[PDB]
Amino acid sequence: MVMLTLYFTPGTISVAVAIAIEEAALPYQPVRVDFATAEQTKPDYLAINPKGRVPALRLEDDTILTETGALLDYVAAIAPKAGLVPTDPTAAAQMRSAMYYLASTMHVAHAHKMRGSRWAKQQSSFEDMTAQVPETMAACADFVESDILRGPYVLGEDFSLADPYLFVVCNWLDGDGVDTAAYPKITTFMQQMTARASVAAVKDKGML
Amino acid sequence: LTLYFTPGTISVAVAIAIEEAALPYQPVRVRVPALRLEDDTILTETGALLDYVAAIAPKAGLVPTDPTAAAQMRSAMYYLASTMHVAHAHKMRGSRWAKQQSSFEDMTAQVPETMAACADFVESDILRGPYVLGEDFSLADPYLFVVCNWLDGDGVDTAAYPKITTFMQQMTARASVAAVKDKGML
Ligand SMILES: N[C@@H](CCC(=O)N[C@@H](CS)C(=O)NCC(=O)O)C(=O)O
Ligand SMILES: N[C@@H](CCC(=O)N[C@@H](CS)C(=O)NCC(=O)O)C(=O)O
Ligand SMILES: [Cl-]
């Protein structure tokens, strides 16, 4: 295959990978996975990603990769001229700290809104977990504001892989009952991101 | 390097990587892990710390030079960070996401099922064998080792997972694992 194929769903974390591919100036083929019919849970998609999640990335040799953070580092690795990962190990580690925080904590908090059935069986448990999301996401936003976002981007002046990842997650905040406006650095960050060519490109492709 | 860790937690995976890289470090017992650099920079998140260790000791070969294999390694690491450790965390840290005692009982009761499902995925789709990438050790391996160590306690019988069993046996034989055991890290 000449180009990368990205399996994605609008409004999901898969969009972070699309943003990175756009920043890398690489051609790619987006494939929409339709949550409205639970396409991600069906045999055809499970043959692509047995975990039943987006994103998944199909490489030129048909290898399938999964996990947003891994795909972001992959894009950087195949497009070094985009400068998406700092050469300084400390700065790159701060970039990855932000990414793993999003993967392990902030996305996970968001996931308890609609995917409570991953960890519980009772309806009352789902209602309990759903009710806590505005508070858990606000606490995550607090940490982003104080300990992740140097400003304007995660690493400060320099855009990096942490930024598309953070952007897509922070895009969930209003919908999760958290005012992004209450966080000045997050607000400035979202304004810079919204103005970038990569983000305009994915919007034009119907991803946001 | 100063590493803040707690025995029997995921922070130990970082110590294992530092041992593999043959870097000197001062373990400080206490989230962990946290890594204090000489300029007093504090770095956090296991997966980020693992890549940091490989970045400062490139001759250790802890990350494949092939970007595909490196992405497969990181896929395993993010899976552990986002799914398997998370599933485990609902056993005793359910209060992160719920308030009602009935929700905690529900969560507790699912842990053997969620952890077994993760073990199934590890066995079939992460662990090529003997290590994550096959014959070649990588950053994914210390991460997987510490997480798989929780399986028995979470109600999952590892004996029924032959690749996980082989993997744990190979890890136990490594100098890095013997070293963190010698330091009381577990
Ligand atoms: N740890 C995974 C999370 C992937 C994930 O959960 N994606 C969501 C959308 S944001 C999904 O596919 N949900 C489908 C479902 O749970 O059925 C990653 O970072 O790639
Ligand atoms: N996303 C973090 C998770 C760190 C974490 O949760 N560590 C646990 C031990 S495995 C902890 O420190 N828990 C403290 C607490 O819950 O009180 C990472 O992978 O580094
Ligand atoms: Cl700066």
Q: Which residues pair with B134 in a beta bridge?
A: B131
The boundaries of every CATH 3.40.30.10 domain in chain B are: 1-61
A203 vs B: CB within 8 A: no
**Tokens at A169, concatenated:** 């997650």
Could you give the CA distance from residue B126 to residue A59 in angstroms, rounded to a whole number?
18
Residue of A63, A77, A103 with shortest CB distance to B81: A103
Half-sphere exposure in the Cβ direction for A86 (13 Å, CA): 20
Residue B29 DSSP class? E
Query: CATH fold of B1-61, please?
Result: Glutaredoxin (3.40.30)
Residue of A61, A65, A125 with shortest CB distance to B102: A125
Query: CATH fold of A1-83+197-208, please?
Result: Glutaredoxin (3.40.30)
| Least distant ligand from the CA of B85 | 2
Select from A53, A57, A71 the residue to mutate for testing ligand 1; criterion: most ligand atoms less than 8 Å from CB. A53
Largest CA distance in chain B: 52
Could you give the CA distance from residue A97 to residue B116 in angstroms, rounded to a whole number?
28
Q: Best mutation site among B46, B50, B73, B78 for testing chain A: the one with the most A CBs within 10 Å?
A: B78
Minimal-distance CA residue of chain B relative to A55:
B75
The gap from C-alpha B170 to its chain's centroid, in whole angstroms, comes to: 15
Q: Rounded to whole angstroms, what are the CA distances from A19 to A162, A196, B35?
A: 11, 10, 30
Contact A77 B71 (CB under 8 A): yes
Contact A67 B48 (CB under 8 A): no
Angle at B43 between CA A87 and CA A85, to 5 degrees: 25
**Residues enclosing ligand 1, CB less than 6 A?**
A 12-13, 40-41, 52-55, 67-68, 103, 115; B 78, 82
Q: Which CATH class, in words, describes the domain spanning B62-186?
A: mainly alpha
Going through chain A in order, the beta strands assigned E by DSSP cover 4-8, 28-32, 56-58, 64-66
Cβ(A82)–Cβ(A167) under 8 Å? Answer: no
Residue B163 DSSP class? H
Select from A32, A54, A71, A133 the residue to mutate for testing ligand 1; criterion: most ligand atoms less than 8 Å from CB. A54
The boundaries of every CATH 1.20.1050.10 domain in chain B are: 62-186
Look at residue A27 and give its three-state secondary structure.
coil
Look at residue B90 and give its three-state secondary structure.
coil
The boundaries of every CATH 1.20.1050.10 domain in chain A are: 84-196
The boundaries of every CATH 3.40.30.10 domain in chain A are: 1-83+197-208
- Count Cβ atoms below 10 Å from residue A30 Cβ, excluding itself: 19
Distance of residue B84 Cα from the nearest chain A Cα, in angstroms: 10
Residue of A67, A120, A121 with shortest CB distance to B74: A67
Query: CATH fold of A84-196, please?
Result: Glutathione S-transferase Yfyf (Class Pi); Chain A, domain 2 (1.20.1050)
Method: X-ray
Nearest CA to ligand 2 atom 2: B45
**Tokens at A46, concatenated:** 């499970």
B108 vs A: CB within 8 A: no
Half-sphere exposure in the Cβ direction for A47 (13 Å, CA): 3
